[PDB]
Design a protein around this nucleic acid. Structure first.
Lengths: 78, 91, 92, 99, 89, 79, 100, 92
DNA sequence: GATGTATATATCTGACACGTGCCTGGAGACTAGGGAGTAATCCCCTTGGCGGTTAAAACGCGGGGGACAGCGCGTACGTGCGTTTAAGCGGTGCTAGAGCTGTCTACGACCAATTGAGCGGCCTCGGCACCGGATTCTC
DNA sequence: GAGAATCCGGTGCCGAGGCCGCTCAATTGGTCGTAGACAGCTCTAGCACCGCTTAAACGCACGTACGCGCTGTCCCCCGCGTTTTAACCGCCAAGGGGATTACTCCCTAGTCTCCAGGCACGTGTCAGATATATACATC
């Protein structure tokens, strides 16, 4: 598997936070799809920094800098 | 009812709505496919950082895409709504 | 050996509030706030040292960068407060 | 023998901002009056957002600032929502927003 | 009817808003944000304002019309334009 | 004396035909005249600042290009 | 003996090195960087102008006009993501028609 | 006295095309293209001279900036072409 | 089948590809000193695993809630057409305004001594998170 | 008109703030080159206006194509109860590599010097623009 960990009540709670009253059924695929096409664009944009400073360890600052360059600025974890 | 209590409850607390280890195994599976062979160490704070970003992004996406279901007279989401909501922005 | 901005935010909070404590996590947010606005303004004013073909950063360029990087009323209060700081800095 | 912020009448530092603004390579020459003004601007911004946060902190009968209070103090105010638009505060949650 | 009008306008490239009303509108709005001071626009910059305004309005009405086909409409109501700005932010 | 009605009743129609809209409604003619105006403020207030800084009463093309680049909507063709 | 012809390029190298010295980007600029930079810029320029020239050829005109660059950018997939926040003067749009 | 990039774009166009002319307006677009990409890459690689606490810009930082600022296949072709330029630059 | 719909050419019109003069920014040379690349090291942060629990997810089920399809009235919108008004050409004037060329001065890098302001480690104790209890609210 | 929602109290617990040691980075002070404020002069290109003229907008009358509310039908998510399951907590070992220091060396920066390239200027001349006129495509 390694994608079915994002289960139905997980996406259901993610929707109920957003104010969605009534949810259809096909969403539980497309959301997983869009989740993957999000995380890929955060991963490699992180790991290039990890390949620049020649270390085998992704620090938290690398992910913060990848999200900085991506557009969604993250606070706190710096 | 029921949902009217759950919207009031989940918008109050500030927890993590996604479990830790499945999200961590997914992030490691995606990280393996790029620049193969070697593994990659993750600090324990970086996965929490990426999880907070992904949860905030998905909650903002559903809350933005819900406004195209009240607009059509419906109540219920559809994948047409989510794909149109991504079509409007340009992501 | 790795500095931060926790002590100064704590002093400002004890100035404008009597005893309101702040947790050690939310203070971290304030670090990533004010290591960020300083990256914008003192970044963007550097750009105005390049369009006019200069090499300095005086108070006037930071003033215009604050006029750009902030919405209306907050920018008006900030530009009204900054020159008030500078004038009592000059007559030392 | 005499502090820079004490001449400035401020609380944020002045020498540290001047050190970062030289070492950051933003320009090859740094005017003297600039980082005092910049530190005053940063002090007013942090003072505004903490002044808005503490009222919501006392509104929830608390005295210790958690990130939810900063989230609410950003999102309820109009002009800070104009400023901090593309920022996801960690451990934040969302506004109470129904229908 | 209209179908010979669209395929003529998505072929050409010239300006649609006339130059002098847009110049008077810009000189009206500019004098309020400078404390009552005139300026002197170069004859090149008004073209830049007008090209950015045309590109922004055309992209906006494309997205608004993408909203109108969702709800079964063909008509473009003012409920549609004030919603395609809150989604885009 | 009208001052925003230089934007006409069919110029909005030409922009909607370029956008590809088959049938405009009514009060759009009173709506778009709002929105454009707001957008021009967030250029011109952002473009009168740069020309204020360089001691120039002339608002050149580079100033509007820089303001549009700062807003996020990058414009190429002029300079 | 020029550094443009020594590396076999067409974009200049001395001008790029001059703009990296006086651009306030780092305190020291290496020698292996600006040749790499000019090569990448030359590849992107050729990538645009090939599609622009082919679209100009298919419209039976022997001159490049900004409508042709508009068509070449908005029809290509990679430059749709590279230039996704770009307005082009004298641009026009794609021929977009859709029904119900 | 005010330089531009028209001559070089004209040389590249006469290289990869026999006689395709280019107007004096669209050439201006190319100026504002390639005074822009150079602002991104050679801007953004400067940021990677700051996160790793360095002071130089070598070829490796520009290589990583090209790996970031471009989508996949175009980035692969660009990184394959740039080192091909550098290797025949080194053995001068 | 008349109304578009594509093509031949008329010529005319100006942008543009090109040729020349020329000023200055790019190449050759070489010293020198800080940046850093390589080598070693030691701890410290991460990875792997045992094990037991306990919330949390999966699965049938039925029931109301909602989406969808047709449909009639009607009204707000496109179109045809005469007018009248404002926009463009273009031409004149003509002067405020970019800019740019000197100058001289206040001003900020640059540098040696020195000391306290701020950072690292530590230790509570009150603030708070959770658990259990007593007072309201709509079907 | 009573299970559910809200406020309240008690108790453990653990991180937030006070405190000390200290060190290195910010202060003070004197030196010198120079970046830029300041003045004045010069070309230029933007604004005001006006006459014309004419292309397009304006106003209106009208026919009718969608907007919308309604309603019938059928399907389809949500709440509920039971079973199953993997996430987590806490621990324990161990080891891979992240951070630190040394040391040489080498590679880029500065200054000087020489000249070839890229820019401004000027000009014939081909590419297309628009315009008219004539051979096909079609509801």
């Amino acid at each position: 598997d390694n994608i079915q960990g994002i289960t139905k009540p997980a996406i259901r709670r993610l929707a109920r936070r957003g104010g969605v009253k009534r949810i259809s059924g096909l969403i539980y695929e497309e959301t997983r799809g869009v989740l993957k096409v999000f995380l890929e664009n955060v991963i490699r944009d992180a790991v290039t920094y990890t390949e620049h400073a020649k270390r085998k360890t992704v620090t938290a600052m690398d992910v913060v800098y990848a999200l900085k360059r991506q557009g969604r600025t993250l606070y706190g974890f710096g | 009812q029921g949902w009217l209590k759950e919207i009031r409850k989940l918008q109050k607390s500030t927890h993590l709505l996604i479990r830790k280890l499945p999200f961590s195994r997914l992030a490691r599976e995606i990280c393996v496919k790029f620049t193969r062979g070697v593994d990659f160490n993750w600090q324990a704070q970086a996965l929490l950082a990426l999880q907070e970003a992904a949860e905030a992004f998905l909650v903002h996406l559903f809350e933005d895409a819900y406004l195209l279901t009240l607009h059509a007279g419906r109540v219920t989401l559809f994948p047409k709504d989510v794909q149109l909501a991504r079509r409007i922005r340009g992501l | 050996r790795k500095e931060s901005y926790s002590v100064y935010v704590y002093k400002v909070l004890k100035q404008v509030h009597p005893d309101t404590g702040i947790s050690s996590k939310a203070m971290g947010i304030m670090n990533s706030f004010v290591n960020d606005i300083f990256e914008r303004i003192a970044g963007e004013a550097s750009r105005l040292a390049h369009y006019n073909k200069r090499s300095t950063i005086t108070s006037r360029e930071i003033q215009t960068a604050v006029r750009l990087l902030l919405p209306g009323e907050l920018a008006k209060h900030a530009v009204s407060e900054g020159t008030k700081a500078v004038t009592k800095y000059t007559s030392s | 023998a005499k502090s820079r912020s004490s001449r400035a009448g401020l609380q944020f530092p002045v020498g540290r901002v001047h050190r970062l603004l030289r070492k950051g390579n933003y320009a090859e020459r740094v005017g003297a009056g600039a980082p005092v003004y910049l530190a005053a601007v940063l002090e007013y911004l942090t003072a505004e957002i903490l002044e808005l946060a503490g009222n919501a902190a006392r509104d929830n009968k608390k005295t210790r600032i958690i990130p939810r209070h900063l989230q609410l103090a950003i999102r309820n105010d109009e002009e800070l929502n104009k400023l901090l638009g593309r920022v996801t505060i960690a451990q934040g949650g969302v506004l109470p927003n129904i229908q």
